Ligand binder design. Sequence first.
Ligand code: R7H
Ligand code: R7H
Ligand code: CA
Ligand code: CA
Ligand code: CL
Ligand code: CL
Ligand code: CL
Ligand code: CL
Lengths: 472, 472
Amino acid sequence: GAALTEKTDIFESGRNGKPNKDGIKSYRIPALLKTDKGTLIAGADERRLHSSDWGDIGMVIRRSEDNGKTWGDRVTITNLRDNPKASDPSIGSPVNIDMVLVQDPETKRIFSIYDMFPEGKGIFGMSSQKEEAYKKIDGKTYQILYREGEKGAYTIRENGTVYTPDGKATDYRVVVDPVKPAYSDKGDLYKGNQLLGNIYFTTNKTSPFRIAKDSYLWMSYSDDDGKTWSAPQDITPMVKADWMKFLGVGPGTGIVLRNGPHKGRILIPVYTTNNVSHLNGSQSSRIIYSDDHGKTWHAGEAVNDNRQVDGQKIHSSTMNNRRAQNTESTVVQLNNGDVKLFMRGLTGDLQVATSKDGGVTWEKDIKRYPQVKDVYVQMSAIHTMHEGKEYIILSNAGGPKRENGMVHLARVEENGELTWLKHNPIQKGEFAYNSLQELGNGEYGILYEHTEKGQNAYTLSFRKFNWDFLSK
Amino acid sequence: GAALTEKTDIFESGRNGKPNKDGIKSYRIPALLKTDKGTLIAGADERRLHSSDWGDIGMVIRRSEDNGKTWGDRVTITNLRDNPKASDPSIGSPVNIDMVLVQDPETKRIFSIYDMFPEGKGIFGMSSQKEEAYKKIDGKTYQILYREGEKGAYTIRENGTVYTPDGKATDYRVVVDPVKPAYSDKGDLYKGNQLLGNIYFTTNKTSPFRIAKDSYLWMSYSDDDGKTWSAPQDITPMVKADWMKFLGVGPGTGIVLRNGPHKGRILIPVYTTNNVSHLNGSQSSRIIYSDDHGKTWHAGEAVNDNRQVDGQKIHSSTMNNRRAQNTESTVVQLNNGDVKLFMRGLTGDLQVATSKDGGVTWEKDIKRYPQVKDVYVQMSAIHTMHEGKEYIILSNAGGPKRENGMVHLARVEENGELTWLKHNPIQKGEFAYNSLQELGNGEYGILYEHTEKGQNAYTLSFRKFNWDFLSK
Ligand SMILES: CCOCCn1cc(CSC[C@@H](O)[C@@H](O)[C@@H]2O[C@H](C(=O)O)C[C@H](O)[C@H]2NC(C)=O)nn1
Ligand SMILES: CCOCCn1cc(CSC[C@@H](O)[C@@H](O)[C@@H]2O[C@H](C(=O)O)C[C@H](O)[C@H]2NC(C)=O)nn1
Ligand SMILES: [Ca+2]
Ligand SMILES: [Ca+2]
Ligand SMILES: [Cl-]
Ligand SMILES: [Cl-]
Ligand SMILES: [Cl-]
Ligand SMILES: [Cl-]
């Protein structure tokens, strides 16, 4: 008997192009996480001014201590302050966008990894020319600041003190230890005790310094079941290669590997572009990972690294092949130790990559499943055991557009092949991003993007699952 | 008063398309070095089968213990063995091409740094897709091998033993410590005691393994005034970034900095291309350098890194601007500590970059001197003192084509500005690459490319001249 709850709204978009009660026009990019304590953390983009992938965006969560009925109030993880002098407020703020949640099972620490850009249009406003973002000086890596009319790289060193290109301390300093709510002060630029501006501002600046215009990866963590969160840490220099243009998360929920020689590794879906073809032919999925409980991070190789396409090998740093792209992804570990990566792409059906070494490298062939539609939108997938049998549940739009959210059920064969045991609809109308979690006791939950009644894209809602609804 | 000696031919090409008496069709790419012992070392590419920038090419030198009057026998530094199964022998050999010579004045070690490519057409045969060439495994960097029909990266580890992608030793091993004359055995691929093939072969292979198809940088060294040479060392992983396509030397003779805080630093001119525009818009000069007497090498930044061209900043890794290219270069240190980089380019006149920090970074604006033409060909320049005043001597083709060799004398003014005083012909007819050295007692030597009497491109000849010839 399909025991599906009714659409329960977690983040409420405005209506008919108008702000909602709190002044927030739009919400997007769901992430759903069940912690050890049992609580559910629903995370999202709080897009205050419009639905687009830039602007004034906060990383926020709400928690439910009762498995999905009472969702508490908003906790803001990060929300950088807007440029008060921007001529166009809609592109007038440093950007945070797209989250992945995961928890370490030993330390219980919870992680939010999300994109950051300086002021502008984010992934759609990236420059054609590289600016160096970091400099290693006597074994230490520092973030670079550029000053108008000077070519050299200033650096942000100890306690935020700004140093000249030649290595001499100055009177300028950056707030590297933010203290205000939502860490709205991160990046503020002081001269002495006087606030001048912010290193993330790119127009009508009131201070002399800015970071490189580039794509960055930030992380925040909570040690009290997601009630309070650390200041953001810039993990970009640990994982971003010198050729990468864009580097960002596949939004959703990561995993911790539960078996095999790499047990305890945290996996975070990400994807890159290169400077050869950027968003037109190089978007490429991979993971980043931590083996030390989130203290340090490393990049896996891309699925597209040394992949054969139409008889010729490509590489994510050099490819120019619109159809060979794979972008946002969701990652699952099997019981045979294998890692499966389900990747948004442009074949029309579901693409899946397999790694035998814990997500670092990927096997030759991308498996395509026409049994599952992919209309080129984010998806989520989780592992679950039922009656001693191993399964995967994957949720995404059924089509033809971002509409008709379906839930697809597969049995995991011994050798890791997937057998799709039919697909049951879960939401009609508009259906876009989504995030699944196993709730335990034969149950499943989902936080997803959906609109009706002229709601602004999107309102994020929660439904519930029973094992019987999945099958038949 | 003015004295120019007569053309003494050091490396003699064949005539009318035919091999010379030794079976060599072509010589190219002079480097000239006066050692501490007084010896002159003349280096060149020995291009057996033809004049093009690929094929069977050896790195060779001759030595003159009498200031350029008589010359000893050819000494071969490196000459990789041909692929005996190649269909076209003219592109059928692993390639060494273009050397920079320099001597460490403290240790007396003499270095030859030169390009390397696997079998093919060198810089003109580079693939559009990147193949990873190196893998770091628990802090140790190993060269990658690719195996027929398999995607993963093997590694060449201790004693040349080949390891599987999964990390298990195999019965295959690479000759990493070559022993034959000219180190023709380097890269040989053995299984057990049976020679199967060579990892630098790329066609009609008899072994299963090859290195990444890419551009490499190698170094060989002599401790006995150039009579004997170490086995080649692969210095690529020390200096080549992950975005770089081509990375190679600007051939000629490097320098050791004689004053300032980086005295003793070895500088080697090099240039790169990127994957965005490669040879059509991205050639970019820089130096590599050693602070530990040649044991380890580092890349400086490109002249074109964060350069403004028509109001827009570029980077060597993303540029696509034919006119902003700078390629092969020759490097000089002034008495005020500054480094000057004279760069082959496409403005028609001489382009000069300046570094204040020992070659690591370059000042904003590239100086052009219309008094010295540049017809897009290599050049050489050296520092020199005369009767207490500071000069630079620079030699290149006078034009309109690669013809009419000139020597240009410039006075180094107070501030490091250059004043071009004289321009004197040194060789009528064809004239291309060249390499200058001070011989002492007010005299100078030059090794250069020229043809006459139906000689194949080129014969490398040597003249000596004196201050009156220069200053006239
Ligand atoms: C006809 C010209 O042929 C070119 C074809 N083409 C393909 C593309 C590419 S997509 C790259 C997308 O994954 C990316 O923008 C994501 O999109 C989201 C979505 O709702 O789809 C929402 C999400 O917040 C956003 N994440 C960021 C960091 O912005 N642009 N043009
Ligand atoms: C209208 C025609 O349009 C084509 C324009 N064009 C010109 C380019 C290329 S230059 C790259 C050259 O520096 C390079 O080959 C060097 O050249 C030498 C030379 O005699 O010039 C000799 C030297 O050994 C060689 N070294 C190597 C590693 O190959 N790419 N496009
Ligand atoms: Ca904001
Ligand atoms: Ca050879
Ligand atoms: Cl500012
Ligand atoms: Cl000989
Ligand atoms: Cl072979
Ligand atoms: Cl000194």
